[PDB]
Write a protein that binds this ligand. Structure first.
Ligand SMILES: CC(=O)SCCNC(=O)CCNC(=O)[C@H](O)C(C)(C)COP(=O)(O)OP(=O)(O)OC[C@H]1O[C@@H](n2cnc3c(N)ncnc32)[C@H](O)[C@@H]1OP(=O)(O)O
Ligand SMILES: CC(=O)SCCNC(=O)CCNC(=O)[C@H](O)C(C)(C)COP(=O)(O)OP(=O)(O)OC[C@H]1O[C@@H](n2cnc3c(N)ncnc32)[C@H](O)[C@@H]1OP(=O)(O)O
Lengths: 66, 157, 81, 81, 172, 66
């Protein structure tokens, strides 16, 4: 539906084509699933860090006073 | 001075921070160059023992911060706690530990808190904390101690 | 040096923009770095053969005192000569 | 907003540029993300109390059989009131 | 079949593929598209057993890659020292297949001898400890075990080993 | 000695200024050491991938028509 420009170095692309051939996918499928599952990891870790800071601010408001 | 009290640092930065001296250049320097900023960057909550003077002559302090124990499980740590040389030997460090324990306890009613770790620099502070109830830890943690929240609660009954 | 054009669904694009802003990279930087790192580790995972306790034991035993080739294998070796 | 002027030797800068190039980032962005991730990591490592076998055991025993407040701390908590 | 040869795949991809049938379509569909793609991507080295004619119809193939093996977790290594060894090199024979025409004529064992031959000549050029082969079913397993290969058991079952020392021995 | 300037966001600096006070450093030395440690990380991992590709090329060239 959308578009993106990605520039590589002939070492990125040969390696990505090799790892696509390994996992039985296209280079498009491989790069898309790579970026996608990595985005899943990244959003999850950001969310966990946000929960850590939420609990932190809770306990810092408790130790100040009611 | 029958008129000294303990308070949260009121973010005035309006305390006589320099005539303080407690015996250790490390804690003196921490109070004078960090404590205000680390209280203002929410890494610690700092409580001051001073008197109701024009400028609230600093005579003691302690810091509290949230921690976890592992190997997340929540707790608090009393990192630093110092008191001027003139007030020493007169159970004022015990009073400030009791006040920090009371703060931790009134926190444990709003947030889950399993206990209070405490930082002890020399064997002086280790004996001192060990004398108030704290459990001496071992190994890499030999310079830390712990007091359960349940004991802090039994205190105030 | 090169170029790849990835046509991308809109939900996945919103998600990748979210994650690339979480790491303060661009969408391009995020996508390419993810591709490269996952490629490296997929290839590393293909090439290696992790042997468990007993498989490792028998491979070691085969290396120290290697067997003698059977008569079938030796006939096969003599054929292609 | 704010700005930090930094001094590095020629070789420090060469290593930073090489590593930032492997990341497909700019030198500035690489240094920024390195400092940011390492500062958040230092902050996390700070507030975590990694106990060993026996210290873990001792905290568990204090949570199981917590002591009774001692005479000294009792007199202190009274001195409060 | 007077004139069979076994050559490395000449990258031009000019052979005759779809007119091949080994009896199981996983290897067949591997030769169909996967073999040339993965040979030219250098994930494998594809050897073709074919006829020495201009038409060059395929009757068999095998695939040789490099590999490296490692143990689960080395226990109790404080005896004297520990110099780690994490990339232990080896050769892996990915898949092998003969046409249904030539089944039962020793041709799998001769393809194995040719693969071990290439492994040996590589062992003179680089460091190779041994040869792993994969066996997807009972029959490939028995085939490989009857040629000297040692079976691995437990989450490594479909994998057999033959040390390069015995390969050196096979060519005395 | 070479000079490199970097722009923060008043919150970031706080974090750095926080961490610099914990690991007993300056903001200058802390940012520099963070970037240099990460530089060593990135560079040694890239050398690992280059060495793996080199060994792969050796063994695969040896397995081709020897
Ligand atoms: C990094 C850290 O957080 S470590 C922090 C510790 N600080 C330092 O090391 C800096 C130097 N010292 C200080 O600043 C601190 O004031 C302390 C808190 C370490 C100093 O101790 P103080 O608080 O002055 O002493 P303390 O509060 O224990 O009071 C002295 C009491 O010990 C009691 N005590 C109990 N047993 C004994 C004994 N066997 N012998 C003598 N005194 C005893 C006494 O009764 C006495 O006063 P009391 O009559 O009111 O009970
Ligand atoms: C993915 C993997 O790596 S697994 C690859 C295996 N592939 C498959 O299983 C798919 C199906 N089959 C195939 O594709 C393959 O052609 C093989 C390679 C599995 C087929 O096996 P073949 O090549 O026919 O076996 P082989 O090469 O041993 O030929 C039969 C020989 O066995 C020999 N043999 C040895 N012992 C005996 C015995 N006790 N009785 C009968 N024959 C015997 C025969 O002598 C005969 O050849 P010869 O008369 O010329 O000496």
């Amino acid at each position: 539906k959308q578009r993106i420009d990605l520039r590589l170095t002939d070492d990125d692309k040969s390696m990505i084509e090799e790892a696509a051939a390994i996992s039985n996918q296209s280079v498009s499928q491989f790069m898309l699933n790579s970026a996608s599952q990595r985005a899943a990891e990244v959003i999850e870790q950001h969310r966990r860090v946000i929960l850590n800071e939420e609990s932190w601010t809770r306990v810092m408001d408790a130790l100040s006073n009611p | 001075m029958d008129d000294l009290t303990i308070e949260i640092l009121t973010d005035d930065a309006d305390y006589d921070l320099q005539r303080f001296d407690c015996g250790e250049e490390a804690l003196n320097l921490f109070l004078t160059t960090h404590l205000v900023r680390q209280h203002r960057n929410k890494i610690l909550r700092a409580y001051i023992l001073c008197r109701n003077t024009p400028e609230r002559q600093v005579l003691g302090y302690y810091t509290l911060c949230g921690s976890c124990f592992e190997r997340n499980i929540p707790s608090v740590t009393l990192g630093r706690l110092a008191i001027d040389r003139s007030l020493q030997g007169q159970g004022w460090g015990a009073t400030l530990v009791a006040h920090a324990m009371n703060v931790v306890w009134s926190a444990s009613l709003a947030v889950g808190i399993h206990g209070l770790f405490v930082e002890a620099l020399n064997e002086k502070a280790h004996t001192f904390y060990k004398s108030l109830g704290f459990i001496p830890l071992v190994g890499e943690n030999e310079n830390a101690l712990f007091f359960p929240t349940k004991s802090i609660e039994l205190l105030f009954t």
